[PDB]
Amino acid sequence: DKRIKDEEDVEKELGLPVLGSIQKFNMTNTRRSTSSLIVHEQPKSPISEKFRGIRSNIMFANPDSAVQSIVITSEAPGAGKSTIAANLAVAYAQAGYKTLIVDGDMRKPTQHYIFNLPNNEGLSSLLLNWSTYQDSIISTEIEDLDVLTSGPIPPNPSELITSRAFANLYDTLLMNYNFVIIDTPPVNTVTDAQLFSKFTGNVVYVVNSENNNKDEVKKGKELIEATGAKLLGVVLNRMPK
Ligand SMILES: Nc1ncnc2c1ncn2[C@@H]1O[C@H](COP(=O)(O)OP(=O)(O)O)[C@@H](O)[C@H]1O
Ligand SMILES: [Mg+2]
């Protein structure tokens, strides 16, 4: 019934460009990757090429665009925000950008799972001054890729995002990294992604082609655009091919 299913649907129903399309993972398109971090584990796979194309699009499709950071978000849970964010981050690092991925989903974080990292310190603890900057950001075994995990689950993420601590951190991150990617919770349920979007001014919108309602997806788009941020485009995920 009501799915945004493909590129035509994105153009016609949402009026956005498609930055890339990510197929549902299989043995062939991931070359039997052991994890969902395809770009790292199988850098020559078809899927890995798609993420490189997304990277090239963001950085080179628009002449004298100067994108320093992006929010990765979606309308609903399970769209593939975390997976797209992590793989895109690796793609940036491989290309030689000093890259940070920030786990800004302080409600249901998964970047520590994806990158196999401890989550005792991270974004929440840093913002609460429980941990230091240098202790909270992890340099991964992937060269040019750092990760700021979510940290412990805080009582009120909104309070942290709107704190002067975060505004000041964000400024510091822009000065320390060539590219910053912020993973977020879904738009329709909490305003976290909208708040982060006010900072980055640039948003990549992930749409699960397998399972979505067009009215819900459209509502999320409108909420993002209402922040004043530029919605760069859509990444279609779980595509049949
Ligand atoms: N293209 C894909 N093919 C198969 N599985 C995927 C794909 N994208 C994401 N997933 C899986 O779907 C689940 C939800 O993805 P996740 O990135 O956590 O979504 P979100 O952050 O939007 O909730 C994860 O287990 C992830 O490995
Ligand atoms: Mg997630």
Other Cβ atoms less than 10 A from the Cβ of 39: the count is 26
Closest to 39 (Cα-Cα) out of 110, 98, 91: 91
**Helix count and strand count (H, E) for the chain:** 11, 8
Q: Which residues carry a binding-site annotation for Mg(2+)?
A: 82, 105, 183
Atom number, ligand 1, closest to the C-alpha of residue 105: 21
In short, whether 111's Cβ falls inside 6 Å of ligand 1 is no
Q: What is the C-alpha radius of gyration for the chain, rounded to an integer number of angstroms?
A: 17
Task: Check pocket membership of 73 for ligand 1, CB cut-off 6 A.
Answer: no
Q: Report yes or no: 112 and 86 within 8 Å, Cβ to Cβ.
A: no
What topology does CATH give the domain 1-241? Answer: Rossmann fold (3.40.50)
- Ligand 1 pocket residue status of 136, Cβ below 6 Å: no
Ligand nearest to the CA of 104: 2
b/e 185-212 (16+ beta carbons within 10 angstroms → b): bbbbeeebbbbbbebbebbbbbbbbeeb
- Distance (Å, whole) CA 118 – CA 3: 37
Residue 235 CA: distances (Å) to CA of 43, 150, 163, 173, 207? 19, 23, 30, 25, 6
What one-letter code names the amino acid at 73?
A: T
**Nearest Cα to Cα of residue 140 among 105, 89, 70:** 89
How far does the centroid of ligand 1 lie from the alpha carbon of residue 163, in Å?
30
> Residue 123: CA atoms inside 13 Å, Cβ hemisphere, count?
32
38 alpha carbon to ligand 1 midpoint, in Å?
12
Domain range list for the chain: 1-241
CA separation, residue 240 to residues 5, 6, 203, 237 (Å): 9, 10, 24, 9
Q: What is the DSSP letter of 25?
A: P
**Best mutation site among 73, 83, 205, 212 for ligand 1 pocket (most ligand atoms within 8 Å of CB):** 83
Q: Count the Cβ atoms, other than its own, within 10 Å of residue 28.
A: 11
Amino acid at 52: R
Cβ(125) to ligand 1 under 6 A?
no
Alpha-carbon distance of 54 to 57, in angstroms, equals: 5
Q: Is the Cβ–Cβ distance between 182 and 200 less than 8 Å? A: yes
Please tell me the total number of residues recorded for the chain in this structure.
241
| DSSP secondary structure, 100-144, as one string | EEEE--SSS--HHHHTT---SSSHHHHHTTSS-HHHHEEE-SSTT
DSSP letter for each residue of 56-108: HHHHHSSTT----EEEEE-SSTTSSHHHHHHHHHHHHHHTT--EEEEE--SSS
Ligand 1 pocket check for 58: Cβ under 6 Å:
no
The closest alpha carbon to 183, from 77, 96, 93, 97, belongs to 77
- Pocket of ligand 1 contains residue 109 by CB under 6 Å: no
